[PDB]
Amino acid sequence: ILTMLVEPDAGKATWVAASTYGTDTTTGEEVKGALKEIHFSTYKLAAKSFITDETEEDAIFSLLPLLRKRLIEAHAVSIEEAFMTGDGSGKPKGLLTLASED
Amino acid sequence: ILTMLVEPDAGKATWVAASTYGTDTTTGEEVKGALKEIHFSTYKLAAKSFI
Amino acid sequence: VNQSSSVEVSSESYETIFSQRIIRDLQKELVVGALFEELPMSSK
């Protein structure tokens, strides 16, 4: 997790009267605030692909370049589908569901 | 004919949960694919003239 | 097409080495075409 502190919101300063002037009340109301925190954590995307010894031999072309590419790609697409509409249960929640929530 | 291989369409990874860490599911589900072929051919045109 | 691979080939045609080596069977033996001598005729 990574927790950062979000500064608390503004609180007004009281308008003291004229009778108050000359008394402890002249100093006015206390303005008091507590820092709040926002927490960041991580989810996981993972995929597996498996060239058997034999497919490699049963092809005129190599076939593992594709695997590794289609591998990296699968991860990129996945972050993407989810960052859009990711429900958020074990997937990153996403901009279009983040919106529904708000 | 000239058959060229077309690469397969995109595949998706599996967001995998906290529960799965340390289990076979941690790694995801297979990203499978298949190359496909496009075959090219020529159809003849002709003309004859005589003088 | 060897589909157990996760990245299979397009069609079996890319899983073969089309080799152009032409072989033929033992082939009948020709015996009487040439046992006989030839008369070089030069007229009908």
Curated annotation (Swiss-Prot), chain A:
Transmembrane segments: none annotated. Changing I79T: Confers resistance to Pycsar-mediated defense. Disulfide bonds: none annotated. It is found in: Virion. It comes from the Viruses. Major capsid protein that self-associates to form 120 hexamers and 11 pentamers, building the T=13 icosahedral capsid which about 860 Angstroms in diameter. Responsible for its self-assembly into a procapsid. The phage does not need to encode a separate scaffolfing protein because its capsid protein contains the delta domain that carries that function. The capsid gains its final stability through the reorganization of the subunits that takes place upon expansion. DNA encapsidation through the portal triggers capsid expansion and the binding of the decoration protein to the capsid exterior. Interacts with the decoration protein; each hexon binds a single copy of the decoration protein. Interacts with the portal protein. This is Major capsid protein. It comes from Escherichia phage T5 (Enterobacteria phage T5). The lineage of its organism: Viruses, Duplodnaviria, Heunggongvirae, Uroviricota, Caudoviricetes. The gene is D20. The chain holds residues 205 to 306 of 458 of the full protein.
